[PDB]
Amino acid sequence: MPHAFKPGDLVFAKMKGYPHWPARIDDIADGAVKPPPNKYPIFFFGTHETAFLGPKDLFPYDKSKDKYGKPNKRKGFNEGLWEIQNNPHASYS
Numbered sequence: 494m495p496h497a498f499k500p501g502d503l504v505f506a507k508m509k510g511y512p513h514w515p516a517r518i519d520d521i522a523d524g525a526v527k528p529p530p531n532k533y534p535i536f537f538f539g540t541h542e543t544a545f546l547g548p549k550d551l552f553p554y555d556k557s558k559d560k561y562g563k564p565n566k567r568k569g570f571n572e573g574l575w576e577i578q579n580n581p582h583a584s585y586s
């Protein structure tokens with residue numbers, strides 16, 4: 494059975510106006526800005542952007558990749574598909 498989300502989990506993450514996007518739950522570094530309550534720091538592959546999202550917008554990657562893991566014209570998306578498949582836990586710093 495599923496657990497709560499934890500750092501390292503792989504997802505597609507939904508933001509308004511954007512397609513479901515390859516992403517991971519990030520850790521928060523010592524001294525770094527913390528997310529609001531009930532939100533997670535989401536690192537978007539390809540764009541390498543971070544946004545704070547709640548579980549309603551987070552779709553586990555294994556379950557969802559058949560639906561959501563297809564190329565997209567949007568900037569950074571195809572790079573993101575490569576990262577989540579091939580090195581999802583690397584530093585993109």
Ligand SMILES: CNc1ccccc1S(C)(=O)=O
Pocket residue numbers: 522523524525
């Ligand atoms: C990564 N944080 C870090 C690194 C070296 C020294 C102090 C810190 S801090 C401001 O978070 O106490």
